[PDB]
Design an enzyme around this catalytic site. Structure first.
Site, mmCIF file in Angstrom:
data_model
loop_
_atom_site.group_PDB
_atom_site.id
_atom_site.type_symbol
_atom_site.label_atom_id
_atom_site.label_comp_id
_atom_site.label_asym_id
_atom_site.label_seq_id
_atom_site.Cartn_x
_atom_site.Cartn_y
_atom_site.Cartn_z
ATOM 1 N N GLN A 19 1.319 -1.426 -0.030
ATOM 2 C CA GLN A 19 -0.023 -0.027 0.062
ATOM 3 C C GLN A 19 0.995 1.252 0.280
ATOM 4 O O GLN A 19 0.472 1.692 -0.409
ATOM 5 C CB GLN A 19 -0.792 -0.169 1.056
ATOM 6 N N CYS A 25 -4.937 0.853 3.998
ATOM 7 C CA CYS A 25 -5.332 -0.780 4.019
ATOM 8 C C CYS A 25 -6.343 -1.445 3.818
ATOM 9 O O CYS A 25 -6.790 -1.984 3.812
ATOM 10 C CB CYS A 25 -4.508 -1.257 5.586
ATOM 11 N N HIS A 159 -5.300 -1.827 12.291
ATOM 12 C CA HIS A 159 -4.674 -1.717 10.903
ATOM 13 C C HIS A 159 -5.697 -3.192 9.766
ATOM 14 O O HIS A 159 -6.213 -3.961 10.908
ATOM 15 C CB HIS A 159 -3.084 -2.032 10.766
ATOM 16 N N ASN A 175 -1.728 -8.837 4.359
ATOM 17 C CA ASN A 175 -0.954 -7.726 4.604
ATOM 18 C C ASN A 175 -0.556 -7.797 3.256
ATOM 19 O O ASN A 175 -0.439 -8.123 2.775
ATOM 20 C CB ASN A 175 0.689 -8.014 5.502
HETATM 21 C C1 LIG Z 1 -4.681 1.408 7.933
HETATM 22 C C2 LIG Z 1 -3.222 1.826 7.306
HETATM 23 O O1 LIG Z 1 -3.506 1.805 6.294
HETATM 24 O O2 LIG Z 1 -2.551 2.299 8.612
HETATM 25 C C3 LIG Z 1 -2.657 0.871 9.547
HETATM 26 C C4 LIG Z 1 -2.079 1.537 10.192
HETATM 27 C C5 LIG Z 1 -5.277 2.894 7.946
HETATM 28 O O3 LIG Z 1 -4.627 3.300 9.222
HETATM 29 C C6 LIG Z 1 -7.098 2.831 8.567
HETATM 30 O O4 LIG Z 1 -7.963 2.759 7.883
HETATM 31 N N1 LIG Z 1 -7.043 2.846 10.404
HETATM 32 C C7 LIG Z 1 -8.704 2.295 10.143
HETATM 33 C C8 LIG Z 1 -8.679 1.185 11.545
HETATM 34 C C9 LIG Z 1 -9.515 -0.111 11.077
HETATM 35 C C10 LIG Z 1 -8.685 -0.127 9.890
HETATM 36 C C11 LIG Z 1 -10.720 0.196 10.715
HETATM 37 C C12 LIG Z 1 -8.782 3.677 11.310
HETATM 38 O O5 LIG Z 1 -10.128 4.269 10.402
HETATM 39 N N2 LIG Z 1 -8.401 4.078 11.757
HETATM 40 C C13 LIG Z 1 -8.648 5.326 12.393
HETATM 41 C C14 LIG Z 1 -9.302 4.586 13.782
HETATM 42 C C15 LIG Z 1 -9.367 6.549 15.085
HETATM 43 C C16 LIG Z 1 -10.044 7.230 14.154
HETATM 44 C C17 LIG Z 1 -10.397 5.991 16.443
#
Ligand SMILES: *[C@@H](C(=O)OCC)[C@H](O)C(=O)N[C@@H](CC(C)C)C(=O)NCCC(C)C
Length: 212
Positions: A19, A25, A159, A175
């Site tokens: 990615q 992700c 993630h 992954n």
């Molecule tokens: C995942 C990524 O590409 O990197 C992982 C470190 C993104 O960061 C992602 O979409 N995270 C996602 C958490 C799960 C997958 C729903 C998200 O929306 N995180 C933020 C949460 C926060 C606002 C409480």
């Protein structure tokens, strides 16, 4: 369900992707499940566009992160294009679905796996690849190079990945960090610890596309 499941051996998993620096992700995770279910239903393994979900899922936040379930609802409502038609650029741009001609694939819905239930998740994986979340911020996860991963990690899930198999002691995870990470891009995460969150929070939030 069997003791071992590995959708890669049934030809339902495409090559591992990277990615890049984009927090996409959630789209990569969703696409794995779409690629899997389309191969399961139609016999054809195709690659589909993470970029399209990145660009077009308005509930998600592009490279700042997003929701596997939203992306999966997008493909059920509209559809998705081939990856070759809508290649990954690693940056959110505008939704270009309309300029790319007719969708290549469409699903019929999204289901959530009952959370905090290892058996429920395994049942789903035995049927098809599933989108799962975990805590990937810890250095132990980041530096994983192989073996059955037990942590350390907390349950601050951050993630989205895809579960494409399992064995007696692990869940097999595709992954999106390229083929250099983990086991050629995969991680086997310990299961059966009685921790209802799952290792690294793996049972927190799991979804799969429905395709009739
Ligand atoms: C995942 C990524 O590409 O990197 C992982 C470190 C993104 O960061 C992602 O979409 N995270 C996602 C958490 C799960 C997958 C729903 C998200 O929306 N995180 C933020 C949460 C926060 C606002 C409480």
């Amino acid at each position: 369900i069997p003791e071992y499941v590995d959708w890669r051996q049934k030809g339902a998993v495409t090559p591992v992707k990277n990615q890049g620096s984009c927090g996409s992700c959630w789209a990569f995770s969703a696409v794995v499940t779409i690629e899997g279910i389309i191969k399961i239903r139609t016999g054809n393994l195709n690659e589909y566009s993470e970029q399209e979900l990145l660009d077009c899922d308005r509930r998600s936040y592009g490279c700042n992160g997003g929701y596997p379930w939203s992306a999966l609802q997008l493909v059920a409502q509209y559809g998705i294009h081939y990856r070759n038609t809508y290649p990954y650029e690693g940056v959110q741009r505008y939704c270009r679905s309309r300029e790319k001609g007719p969708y290549a694939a469409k699903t019929d819905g999204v289901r959530q796996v009952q959370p905090y239930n290892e058996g429920a998740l395994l049942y789903s994986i035995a049927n098809q690849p599933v989108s799962v979340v975990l805590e990937a911020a810890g250095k132990d996860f980041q530096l994983y190079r192989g073996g059955i991963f037990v942590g350390p990690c907390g349950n601050k899930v951050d993630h989205a990945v895809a579960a494409v198999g399992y064995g007696p002691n692990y869940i097999l995870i595709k992954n999106s960090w390229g083929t250099g990470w983990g086991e050629n891009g995969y991680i086997r995460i310990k299961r059966g610890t009685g921790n209802s969150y799952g290792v690294c929070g793996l049972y927190t939030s799991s979804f799969y596309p429905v395709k009739n």
